[PDB]
Amino acid sequence: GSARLKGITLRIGVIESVPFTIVANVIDGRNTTKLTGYVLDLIEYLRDKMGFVADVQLAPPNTSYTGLVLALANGDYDIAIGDITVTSARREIVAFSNSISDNSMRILMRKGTLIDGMDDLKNGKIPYNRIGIRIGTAGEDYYLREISGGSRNFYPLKSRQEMYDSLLAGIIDVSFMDIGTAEYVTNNIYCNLTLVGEDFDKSTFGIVTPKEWLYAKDLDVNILSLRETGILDNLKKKWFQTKACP
Amino acid sequence: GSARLKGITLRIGVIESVPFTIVANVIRNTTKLTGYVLDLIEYLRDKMGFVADVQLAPPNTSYTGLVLALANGDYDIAIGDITVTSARREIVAFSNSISDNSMRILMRKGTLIDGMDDLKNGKIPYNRIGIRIGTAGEDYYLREISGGSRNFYPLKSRQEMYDSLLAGIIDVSFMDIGTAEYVTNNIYCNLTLVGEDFDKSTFGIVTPKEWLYAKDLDVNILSLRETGILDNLKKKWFQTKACP
Ligand SMILES: N[C@@H](Cc1ccccc1)C(=O)O
Ligand SMILES: N[C@@H](Cc1ccccc1)C(=O)O
Ligand SMILES: [Cl-]
Ligand SMILES: [Cl-]
Ligand SMILES: [Cl-]
Ligand SMILES: [Cl-]
């Protein structure tokens, strides 16, 4: 069957990833967290349009994207919204909404690094333990399928912060990120970093839902309507069209 | 519940649209089909083990008409350059995306159009804007240009669109970018695309709502993406440029 989400409480899993989901520690005299970003704005549009009660739950620190999907499949959340890549392995265990965004990956490196693209990584110009890969992500899947043939011979990373510190501290030479956030970091957060080469792994982001979900149609119709009316485009411009770096 | 498509017969609706689904007449007449869509069917059939009963939609069937026919049970799935839209999703489901999409404005070379704003500002008499009925282009026009008014020059087939542009009966039309690039680079060398692309969207395989086999088809589509087969197919069918 199918039904409307009007009146329904949804526990919505979100995962820290600037500027999709931005976590601010604030004291207001008690310490609390404030969430903002593209994802929280999207949640507000959907809530206002669909009438569900949003119960937004931030995934614990160092939760992987795979861990978030597994947690939903196990019943810890009703839906999960973020920069979450739709993959065949995930689709085996959860469903996804219509796409909220196209996606691809790029190679991130320190400026001045003598790398010109993916060919250098595939030909072994960089030792493999100096390629940083965020575990439990689509980038790990790609690496294992296309670069290393199954072997996790990369340098593992648990958060964007560890990627930052490792690259800057010269522990790794490159890493992989989704293009939207990769552009964002190199343009606003770490000006010493840059993107190199062509993008790869063309893909999409989707809202994660349970398989065979009662509310699949209601969510999909609404997401498509936001796509059609330019709301998703506006949110992308709002949160991603910025460059603080000189 | 859910299940696998192995050994199951699927009636697969396809719709003429070069070079997704290419229709040739051969002779005692018979029809041959080739294209991106037919190759995709073969890859999915080989991976999934279903039995494919491929059925071409009657001439001048619109895209809305194909979707409606599937909702009415004439087909089990429909595969083509079929735009995923909110209105269609009310009555059918869609597989994971097989491709990104957008639209562009199609015109004769030499026509002085900057882009969509000219159309929105009334630079072009509305009966000289050709719109293929029962397509996402009509939906866009009604929503963004004419305020719900069907005041365009209605087109029933891709051929009527070309004929009308070439004969000077209309000044512009809308087409999906993949097929638009194909026709302007290979078939009608005196036509061209102009302006920014608009109506960013996706193509998806049409399935019944709440379909038993939804996961099986989706996992398999995503697998074809991941392993580069969809890219290979796009390269095969769309990278040609015969026009000088
Ligand atoms: N989109 C990736 C997660 C990711 C986000 C940002 C940077 C790198 C990886 C996934 O779903 O696995
Ligand atoms: N993709 C359009 C149909 C179309 C195909 C090719 C060119 C123009 C329009 C739809 O689904 O409505
Ligand atoms: Cl989609
Ligand atoms: Cl499912
Ligand atoms: Cl998708
Ligand atoms: Cl449905």
Coordinates of C-alpha atoms and ligand atoms in Angstrom, one line a residue:
Chain A
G1 CA 0.0 0.0 0.0
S2 CA 0.9 3.7 0.0
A3 CA 0.1 6.6 2.4
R4 CA 0.8 10.3 3.1
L5 CA 3.4 11.3 5.7
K6 CA 1.1 14.0 7.0
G7 CA 1.0 13.8 10.8
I8 CA 3.8 11.1 10.9
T9 CA 6.9 11.5 13.0
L10 CA 10.1 10.6 11.0
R11 CA 13.4 10.0 12.7
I12 CA 15.7 11.5 10.1
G13 CA 19.4 10.5 10.2
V14 CA 21.9 13.1 9.1
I15 CA 25.7 13.0 9.0
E16 CA 28.2 15.9 9.4
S17 CA 29.5 17.1 6.1
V18 CA 29.9 20.8 5.4
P19 CA 27.9 22.5 3.8
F20 CA 25.2 19.7 3.6
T21 CA 25.0 19.2 7.4
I22 CA 27.0 21.7 9.5
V23 CA 27.3 21.1 13.2
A24 CA 27.9 24.0 15.5
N25 CA 28.7 23.8 19.2
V26 CA 27.0 26.6 21.0
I27 CA 26.3 27.5 24.6
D28 CA 22.8 28.8 24.9
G29 CA 24.3 28.7 29.6
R30 CA 24.1 25.1 28.5
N31 CA 26.2 23.5 25.7
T32 CA 24.1 22.4 22.8
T33 CA 24.5 21.6 19.1
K34 CA 22.9 23.6 16.2
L35 CA 22.5 22.0 12.8
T36 CA 22.3 24.1 9.6
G37 CA 23.0 23.6 5.9
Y38 CA 21.6 22.4 2.6
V39 CA 20.2 19.2 4.3
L40 CA 18.4 21.1 7.1
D41 CA 16.9 23.5 4.6
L42 CA 15.7 20.6 2.5
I43 CA 14.2 19.0 5.5
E44 CA 12.3 22.2 6.3
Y45 CA 10.9 22.4 2.7
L46 CA 9.7 18.8 2.9
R47 CA 8.3 19.2 6.4
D48 CA 6.3 22.3 5.4
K49 CA 5.0 20.7 2.2
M50 CA 4.4 17.1 3.6
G51 CA 3.4 17.8 7.2
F52 CA 5.5 15.1 9.0
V53 CA 7.1 15.9 12.3
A54 CA 10.9 15.9 11.7
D55 CA 13.0 14.3 14.4
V56 CA 16.4 15.0 13.2
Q57 CA 19.2 12.8 14.6
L58 CA 22.9 13.5 14.0
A59 CA 24.9 10.3 13.5
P60 CA 27.6 9.8 16.1
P61 CA 31.1 11.0 15.4
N62 CA 33.2 8.9 13.0
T63 CA 30.0 7.1 11.7
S64 CA 30.7 6.1 8.1
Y65 CA 28.2 6.5 5.3
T66 CA 27.9 2.7 5.1
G67 CA 27.3 2.7 8.9
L68 CA 24.5 5.2 8.5
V69 CA 22.8 3.0 5.8
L70 CA 23.2 -0.1 8.0
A71 CA 21.8 1.7 11.0
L72 CA 18.7 2.6 9.0
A73 CA 18.3 -0.9 7.6
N74 CA 18.4 -2.1 11.2
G75 CA 15.6 0.3 12.2
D76 CA 17.6 3.1 14.0
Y77 CA 16.2 5.8 11.6
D78 CA 13.1 6.1 9.3
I79 CA 15.0 8.0 6.6
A80 CA 18.4 9.4 6.1
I81 CA 19.2 12.6 4.2
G82 CA 22.7 13.7 3.2
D83 CA 25.3 13.5 0.6
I84 CA 24.7 9.8 0.3
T85 CA 25.7 8.1 -2.9
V86 CA 23.3 5.6 -4.4
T87 CA 25.2 2.3 -4.9
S88 CA 24.2 -1.2 -5.9
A89 CA 25.4 -2.7 -2.6
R90 CA 23.3 -0.2 -0.6
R91 CA 20.3 -0.7 -2.8
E92 CA 20.4 -4.4 -1.9
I93 CA 19.5 -3.5 1.7
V94 CA 17.6 -0.1 1.5
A95 CA 15.6 1.9 -1.0
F96 CA 16.4 5.4 -2.3
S97 CA 14.3 8.4 -3.2
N98 CA 14.5 10.0 -6.6
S99 CA 17.9 11.6 -6.9
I100 CA 18.4 14.9 -5.1
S101 CA 21.6 15.6 -7.0
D102 CA 24.1 14.4 -9.5
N103 CA 27.5 13.6 -8.3
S104 CA 31.1 12.5 -9.2
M105 CA 34.4 12.4 -7.4
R106 CA 37.6 14.3 -7.8
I107 CA 41.2 13.8 -6.5
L108 CA 42.2 16.2 -3.7
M109 CA 45.9 17.0 -3.1
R110 CA 48.2 19.6 -1.6
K111 CA 49.2 22.3 -4.1
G112 CA 52.5 21.6 -5.7
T113 CA 52.2 17.9 -5.5
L114 CA 53.6 16.3 -8.7
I115 CA 50.4 14.4 -9.8
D116 CA 48.3 15.1 -12.9
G117 CA 45.4 12.8 -12.4
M118 CA 44.0 9.2 -11.9
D119 CA 46.5 7.7 -14.4
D120 CA 49.3 8.5 -11.9
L121 CA 47.4 6.7 -9.1
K122 CA 46.7 3.7 -11.3
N123 CA 50.2 3.5 -12.5
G124 CA 51.6 3.6 -8.9
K125 CA 53.4 7.0 -8.9
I126 CA 52.1 7.4 -5.4
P127 CA 52.7 4.6 -2.8
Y128 CA 49.2 3.2 -2.1
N129 CA 49.5 3.7 1.6
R130 CA 49.8 7.5 0.8
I131 CA 46.4 7.5 -0.9
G132 CA 43.9 8.5 1.9
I133 CA 40.4 6.8 1.6
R134 CA 37.5 7.5 3.8
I135 CA 36.3 4.1 5.0
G136 CA 32.7 3.0 4.5
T137 CA 32.2 5.3 1.5
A138 CA 31.6 5.1 -2.2
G139 CA 35.1 6.3 -2.6
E140 CA 36.4 3.2 -0.9
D141 CA 34.2 1.1 -3.2
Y142 CA 35.6 2.7 -6.3
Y143 CA 39.2 2.4 -5.0
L144 CA 38.7 -1.3 -4.3
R145 CA 37.1 -2.0 -7.7
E146 CA 39.3 0.1 -10.0
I147 CA 42.6 0.7 -8.3
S148 CA 43.6 -2.0 -5.9
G149 CA 41.6 -5.1 -6.9
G150 CA 40.1 -5.7 -3.4
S151 CA 43.0 -4.9 -1.2
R152 CA 42.5 -2.1 1.4
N153 CA 46.1 -1.0 0.9
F154 CA 45.2 2.7 1.2
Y155 CA 45.6 4.9 4.2
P156 CA 42.3 4.8 6.1
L157 CA 40.4 7.9 7.2
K158 CA 37.5 8.2 9.6
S159 CA 36.3 11.8 9.1
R160 CA 37.0 14.8 6.9
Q161 CA 39.1 16.2 9.7
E162 CA 41.5 13.3 9.6
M163 CA 41.7 13.8 5.8
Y164 CA 42.6 17.4 6.4
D165 CA 45.2 16.8 9.0
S166 CA 46.8 13.9 7.2
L167 CA 47.1 15.8 3.9
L168 CA 48.4 18.9 5.6
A169 CA 50.8 16.9 7.9
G170 CA 52.1 15.1 4.8
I171 CA 51.0 11.7 5.9
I172 CA 49.1 11.1 2.6
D173 CA 49.5 12.7 -0.8
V174 CA 46.0 12.4 -2.2
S175 CA 42.4 11.6 -1.2
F176 CA 39.0 11.2 -3.0
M177 CA 35.9 13.4 -2.3
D178 CA 32.6 14.0 -3.9
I179 CA 32.9 17.0 -6.3
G180 CA 30.5 19.4 -4.5
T181 CA 32.1 19.1 -1.1
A182 CA 35.6 18.8 -2.7
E183 CA 35.1 22.1 -4.4
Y184 CA 33.7 23.6 -1.2
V185 CA 36.7 22.7 0.9
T186 CA 39.4 23.7 -1.6
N187 CA 37.6 27.0 -2.1
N188 CA 36.6 28.0 1.5
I189 CA 38.4 25.9 4.1
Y190 CA 41.8 24.7 3.0
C191 CA 43.2 27.1 0.5
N192 CA 46.5 25.2 0.3
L193 CA 44.6 22.2 -1.2
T194 CA 43.5 21.7 -4.8
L195 CA 41.7 19.4 -7.1
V196 CA 43.5 17.6 -10.0
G197 CA 42.5 15.6 -13.0
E198 CA 39.1 14.6 -14.4
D199 CA 36.1 13.7 -12.3
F200 CA 35.1 10.0 -12.0
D201 CA 32.4 7.7 -10.7
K202 CA 29.4 9.6 -12.0
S203 CA 26.6 8.9 -9.6
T204 CA 23.7 10.4 -7.7
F205 CA 22.7 11.2 -4.1
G206 CA 19.4 10.0 -2.8
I207 CA 17.4 10.0 0.4
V208 CA 17.6 6.6 2.1
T209 CA 14.4 4.9 3.0
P210 CA 13.5 1.3 4.0
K211 CA 12.8 -1.2 1.2
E212 CA 9.2 -1.4 0.2
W213 CA 8.4 1.8 2.1
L214 CA 4.7 2.7 2.7
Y215 CA 5.6 6.4 2.0
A216 CA 7.8 5.9 -1.1
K217 CA 5.5 7.7 -3.5
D218 CA 4.7 10.7 -1.3
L219 CA 8.4 11.4 -0.8
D220 CA 9.3 10.8 -4.4
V221 CA 6.6 13.1 -5.7
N222 CA 7.6 15.9 -3.4
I223 CA 11.4 15.6 -4.2
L224 CA 10.5 15.7 -7.9
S225 CA 8.4 18.7 -7.4
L226 CA 11.3 20.5 -5.6
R227 CA 13.5 19.6 -8.5
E228 CA 11.0 20.9 -11.1
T229 CA 10.3 24.2 -9.3
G230 CA 14.0 25.0 -8.9
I231 CA 14.2 24.7 -5.0
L232 CA 17.0 22.1 -5.1
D233 CA 18.9 24.4 -7.5
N234 CA 18.3 27.4 -5.2
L235 CA 19.6 25.4 -2.2
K236 CA 22.7 24.3 -4.1
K237 CA 23.5 27.9 -5.0
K238 CA 22.8 29.1 -1.4
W239 CA 25.2 26.7 0.3
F240 CA 27.8 26.0 -2.4
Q241 CA 28.3 29.2 -4.4
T242 CA 31.0 30.7 -2.2
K243 CA 34.7 31.1 -2.3
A244 CA 36.5 32.6 0.7
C245 CA 40.0 31.4 -0.5
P246 CA 42.0 34.0 -2.6
Chain B
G1 CA 7.5 -8.6 -0.9
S2 CA 10.1 -9.0 -3.6
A3 CA 11.5 -11.5 -6.2
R4 CA 14.1 -12.0 -8.9
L5 CA 13.3 -11.7 -12.6
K6 CA 15.1 -14.9 -13.7
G7 CA 13.1 -16.9 -16.1
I8 CA 10.2 -14.4 -16.0
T9 CA 8.8 -12.9 -19.2
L10 CA 8.7 -9.1 -19.3
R11 CA 6.7 -7.2 -21.9
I12 CA 9.1 -4.2 -22.5
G13 CA 7.6 -1.1 -24.1
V14 CA 10.0 1.0 -26.2
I15 CA 9.4 4.2 -28.2
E16 CA 11.0 5.4 -31.4
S17 CA 13.7 8.0 -30.6
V18 CA 17.0 8.0 -32.5
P19 CA 19.5 6.8 -31.3
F20 CA 17.9 5.3 -28.2
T21 CA 15.4 3.3 -30.2
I22 CA 15.9 3.2 -33.9
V23 CA 13.2 1.8 -36.2
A24 CA 14.0 0.4 -39.6
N25 CA 11.5 -1.0 -42.1
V26 CA 12.7 -4.1 -43.9
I27 CA 11.5 -6.4 -46.7
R28 CA 6.8 -8.7 -47.1
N29 CA 7.5 -6.0 -44.5
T30 CA 9.1 -6.4 -41.0
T31 CA 10.6 -4.0 -38.5
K32 CA 14.1 -4.0 -37.1
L33 CA 15.0 -2.3 -33.8
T34 CA 18.5 -1.1 -32.8
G35 CA 20.0 1.5 -30.5
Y36 CA 21.1 2.3 -27.0
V37 CA 17.8 1.0 -25.5
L38 CA 18.1 -2.4 -27.3
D39 CA 21.7 -2.9 -26.2
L40 CA 20.7 -2.0 -22.6
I41 CA 17.9 -4.6 -22.7
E42 CA 20.5 -7.2 -23.8
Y43 CA 22.8 -6.3 -20.9
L44 CA 20.0 -6.4 -18.3
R45 CA 18.6 -9.7 -19.8
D46 CA 22.0 -11.3 -19.7
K47 CA 22.6 -10.3 -16.0
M48 CA 19.1 -10.9 -14.8
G49 CA 17.9 -13.9 -16.9
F50 CA 14.4 -12.5 -17.7
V51 CA 12.8 -13.3 -21.1
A52 CA 12.4 -10.1 -23.1
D53 CA 9.2 -9.5 -25.1
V54 CA 10.1 -6.2 -26.7
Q55 CA 7.2 -4.2 -28.0
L56 CA 7.4 -0.9 -30.0
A57 CA 4.8 1.7 -29.1
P58 CA 2.5 2.5 -32.1
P59 CA 3.5 5.6 -34.3
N60 CA 2.9 9.0 -32.7
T61 CA 2.5 7.5 -29.2
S62 CA 3.5 10.3 -26.9
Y63 CA 5.7 9.8 -23.8
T64 CA 2.8 10.5 -21.6
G65 CA 0.9 7.9 -23.7
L66 CA 3.6 5.3 -23.1
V67 CA 3.5 5.9 -19.4
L68 CA -0.3 5.7 -19.3
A69 CA -0.2 2.5 -21.3
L70 CA 2.1 0.9 -18.8
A71 CA -0.1 2.1 -15.9
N72 CA -3.1 0.5 -17.7
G73 CA -1.1 -2.8 -17.9
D74 CA -0.1 -2.8 -21.6
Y75 CA 3.5 -3.3 -20.6
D76 CA 5.5 -4.6 -17.6
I77 CA 8.3 -2.0 -17.9
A78 CA 9.1 0.7 -20.4
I79 CA 12.7 1.6 -21.3
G80 CA 13.7 4.7 -23.2
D81 CA 14.6 8.4 -23.0
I82 CA 11.7 8.8 -20.5
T83 CA 11.9 11.8 -18.2
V84 CA 11.1 11.2 -14.5
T85 CA 8.5 13.8 -13.5
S86 CA 6.4 14.3 -10.3
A87 CA 3.2 13.9 -12.3
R88 CA 4.2 10.6 -13.9
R89 CA 5.4 9.3 -10.5
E90 CA 1.9 9.7 -9.1
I91 CA 0.9 6.8 -11.5
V92 CA 4.0 4.7 -12.1
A93 CA 7.3 4.2 -10.4
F94 CA 10.8 4.7 -11.9
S95 CA 13.9 2.7 -11.6
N96 CA 17.2 4.2 -10.6
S97 CA 18.3 6.8 -13.1
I98 CA 19.8 5.5 -16.3
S99 CA 21.1 8.9 -17.3
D100 CA 21.1 12.6 -16.4
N101 CA 19.1 14.8 -18.8
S102 CA 18.3 18.4 -19.5
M103 CA 16.6 20.3 -22.4
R104 CA 17.9 22.8 -24.9
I105 CA 16.3 25.1 -27.4
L106 CA 16.4 23.8 -31.0
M107 CA 16.3 26.3 -34.0
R108 CA 17.5 26.9 -37.6
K109 CA 21.0 28.3 -37.9
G110 CA 20.8 32.0 -38.4
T111 CA 17.8 32.6 -36.1
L112 CA 18.5 35.4 -33.6
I113 CA 17.6 33.8 -30.2
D114 CA 19.8 34.4 -27.2
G115 CA 18.1 31.8 -25.0
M116 CA 15.0 31.1 -22.9
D117 CA 14.5 34.7 -21.8
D118 CA 13.6 35.7 -25.4
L119 CA 10.8 33.1 -25.2
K120 CA 9.6 34.3 -21.8
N121 CA 9.7 37.9 -23.0
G122 CA 7.5 37.4 -26.0
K123 CA 10.1 37.9 -28.7
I124 CA 8.7 34.9 -30.5
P125 CA 5.0 34.6 -31.5
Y126 CA 3.7 31.7 -29.5
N127 CA 2.3 29.8 -32.5
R128 CA 5.9 29.8 -33.7
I129 CA 7.2 27.8 -30.7
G130 CA 6.8 24.2 -31.4
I131 CA 6.1 21.9 -28.5
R132 CA 5.8 18.1 -28.7
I133 CA 2.6 17.2 -26.9
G134 CA 2.7 14.6 -24.0
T135 CA 6.3 15.3 -23.2
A136 CA 8.2 17.0 -20.4
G137 CA 8.8 19.9 -22.8
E138 CA 5.0 20.7 -22.8
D139 CA 5.0 20.5 -19.0
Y140 CA 7.9 23.0 -18.8
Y141 CA 6.4 25.4 -21.3
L142 CA 3.1 25.4 -19.5
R143 CA 4.7 25.9 -16.1
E144 CA 7.5 28.5 -17.0
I145 CA 6.4 30.2 -20.2
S146 CA 2.7 30.5 -20.8
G147 CA 1.1 30.3 -17.3
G148 CA -0.9 27.1 -18.1
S149 CA -2.0 28.3 -21.5
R150 CA -1.7 25.8 -24.4
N151 CA -0.9 28.5 -27.0
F152 CA 2.0 26.9 -28.7
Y153 CA 2.3 25.1 -32.0
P154 CA 1.6 21.5 -31.2
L155 CA 3.8 18.8 -32.6
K156 CA 3.0 15.0 -32.7
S157 CA 6.2 13.4 -33.8
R158 CA 9.9 14.2 -33.9
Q159 CA 9.5 14.3 -37.7
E160 CA 6.8 17.0 -37.6
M161 CA 9.2 19.1 -35.4
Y162 CA 12.0 18.9 -38.0
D163 CA 9.7 19.5 -40.9
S164 CA 8.1 22.5 -39.2
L165 CA 11.5 24.1 -38.3
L166 CA 13.0 23.4 -41.7
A167 CA 9.9 24.8 -43.5
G168 CA 9.9 27.9 -41.4
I169 CA 6.5 27.2 -39.8
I170 CA 8.1 27.5 -36.3
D171 CA 11.2 29.3 -35.1
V172 CA 12.1 27.1 -32.1
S173 CA 11.4 23.9 -30.3
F174 CA 12.6 22.1 -27.2
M175 CA 14.5 18.8 -27.1
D176 CA 16.3 16.7 -24.6
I177 CA 20.1 17.4 -24.9
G178 CA 21.3 13.9 -25.9
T179 CA 19.0 13.5 -28.8
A180 CA 19.2 17.2 -29.7
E181 CA 23.0 17.0 -30.0
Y182 CA 22.6 13.8 -32.1
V183 CA 20.3 15.3 -34.7
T184 CA 22.1 18.6 -35.0
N185 CA 25.5 16.8 -35.4
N186 CA 24.4 13.9 -37.7
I187 CA 21.1 14.4 -39.4
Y188 CA 20.1 18.1 -39.8
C189 CA 23.3 20.0 -40.1
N190 CA 21.5 23.4 -40.6
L191 CA 19.8 23.1 -37.2
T192 CA 21.5 24.1 -34.0
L193 CA 21.1 24.4 -30.2
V194 CA 21.1 27.7 -28.4
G195 CA 21.0 28.9 -24.8
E196 CA 21.6 27.4 -21.4
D197 CA 20.2 23.9 -20.8
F198 CA 17.1 23.9 -18.6
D199 CA 14.9 21.5 -16.7
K200 CA 17.7 19.4 -15.4
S201 CA 16.2 15.9 -14.9
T202 CA 16.8 12.2 -15.2
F203 CA 15.7 9.3 -17.4
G204 CA 14.4 6.1 -15.6
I205 CA 12.8 2.8 -16.6
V206 CA 9.1 2.9 -16.0
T207 CA 7.7 0.2 -13.7
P208 CA 4.4 -0.4 -12.0
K209 CA 4.0 1.2 -8.6
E210 CA 5.0 -1.0 -5.7
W211 CA 6.6 -3.5 -8.1
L212 CA 7.6 -6.9 -6.8
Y213 CA 10.9 -6.7 -8.8
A214 CA 12.0 -3.2 -8.0
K215 CA 15.1 -4.0 -6.1
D216 CA 16.3 -6.6 -8.6
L217 CA 16.1 -4.1 -11.5
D218 CA 17.6 -1.2 -9.5
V219 CA 20.6 -3.2 -8.2
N220 CA 21.3 -4.3 -11.7
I221 CA 21.1 -0.8 -13.2
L222 CA 23.4 0.5 -10.5
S223 CA 25.8 -2.3 -11.3
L224 CA 25.8 -1.4 -15.0
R225 CA 26.7 2.2 -14.0
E226 CA 29.4 1.2 -11.6
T227 CA 31.2 -1.1 -14.0
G228 CA 31.0 1.5 -16.8
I229 CA 28.5 -0.2 -19.1
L230 CA 26.1 2.8 -19.3
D231 CA 29.1 5.1 -20.1
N232 CA 30.2 2.6 -22.8
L233 CA 26.7 2.6 -24.3
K234 CA 26.5 6.4 -24.3
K235 CA 29.8 6.5 -26.1
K236 CA 28.8 3.9 -28.6
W237 CA 25.5 5.5 -29.6
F238 CA 26.0 9.3 -29.1
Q239 CA 29.7 10.2 -30.0
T240 CA 29.2 10.4 -33.7
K241 CA 29.4 13.7 -35.7
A242 CA 28.7 13.3 -39.5
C243 CA 28.0 17.0 -40.1
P244 CA 31.0 19.0 -41.3
Ligands
LIG1 N1 28.9 10.3 -0.8 C1 29.8 9.4 -0.1 C2 30.3 9.9 1.2 C3 31.3 11.0 1.1 C4 30.9 12.4 1.3 C5 31.9 13.4 1.2 C6 33.2 13.1 0.9 C7 33.6 11.7 0.7 C8 32.6 10.7 0.8 C9 29.0 8.1 0.2 O1 27.8 8.1 0.3 O2 29.7 7.1 0.5
LIG2 N1 12.1 12.9 -22.6 C1 10.8 13.4 -23.0 C2 10.4 13.0 -24.4 C3 11.3 13.5 -25.4 C4 12.2 12.7 -26.1 C5 13.1 13.1 -27.0 C6 13.2 14.5 -27.4 C7 12.2 15.4 -26.7 C8 11.3 14.9 -25.8 C9 9.7 12.9 -22.1 O1 9.9 11.9 -21.4 O2 8.6 13.5 -22.1
CL3 CL 15.8 10.1 -10.4
CL4 CL 12.9 -2.3 -2.4
CL5 CL 19.5 7.5 -8.9
CL6 CL 4.8 3.6 -5.6

